Design a protein around this ligand. Structure first.
Ligand code: AP5
Length: 135
């Protein structure tokens, strides 16, 4: 879920682009401290935010995770990524959660929307908001 100081695009960047350590246990502390729980799994794409914005310009397709949405876009090329999986869940001390890390080279599908009018920078009228699938 999204903390209130984020737009959807800023939250996408925080969860899926800004991997603050190459180790999942460390990188996941940021997400988990913002969500107040240990997220069970999460992908970080080793690409730039601008590259994702350009994927939002690729043809629209149906989102595989929800057949009623048509705001998804295929990456066209594969990228390197790291997928983090929770190995150790620490209910009453989220900083003690630990993760496994899996490196891969995969395509991705992102949902994009119009930016948040009040809070997102006008530089990018169209922004990624959800990571629908890795393939
Ligand atoms: N087998 C597997 N292999 C690899 N990865 C796997 C996997 N199984 C699960 N995953 C991924 O693991 C993560 C954890 O899933 P899960 O463990 O199932 O839990 P979750 O954290 O409660 O769920 P969220 O959907 O809210 O996850 P998120 O914050 O990552 O969502 P996202 O940034 O994409 O989206 C942000 C928000 O966008 C919103 N949204 C969904 N669809 C659209 C859409 N078309 N357009 C705009 N917003 C949309 C929702 O509110 C969503 O919360 C989810 O990304 C999932 O996709």
């Amino acid at each position: 879920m999204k903390p209130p100081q984020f737009t959807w695009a800023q939250w996408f960047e925080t969860q899926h682009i800004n991997m603050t350590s190459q180790q999942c246990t460390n990188a996941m502390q940021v997400i988990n401290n913002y969500q107040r729980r240990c997220k069970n799994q999460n992908t970080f794409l080793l690409t730039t935010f601008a590259n994702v914005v350009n994927v939002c310009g690729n043809p629209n397709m149906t989102c595989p995770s929800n057949k009623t949405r048509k705001n998804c876009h295929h990456s066209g090329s594969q990228v390197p990524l790291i997928h983090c999986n929770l190995t150790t869940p620490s209910p009453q001390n989220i900083s003690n959660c630990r993760y496994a890390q899996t490196p891969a080279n995969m395509f991705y599908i992102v949902a994009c929307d119009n930016r948040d009018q009040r809070r997102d920078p006008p530089q990018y009228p169209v922004v990624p908001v959800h990571l629908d699938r890795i393939i």
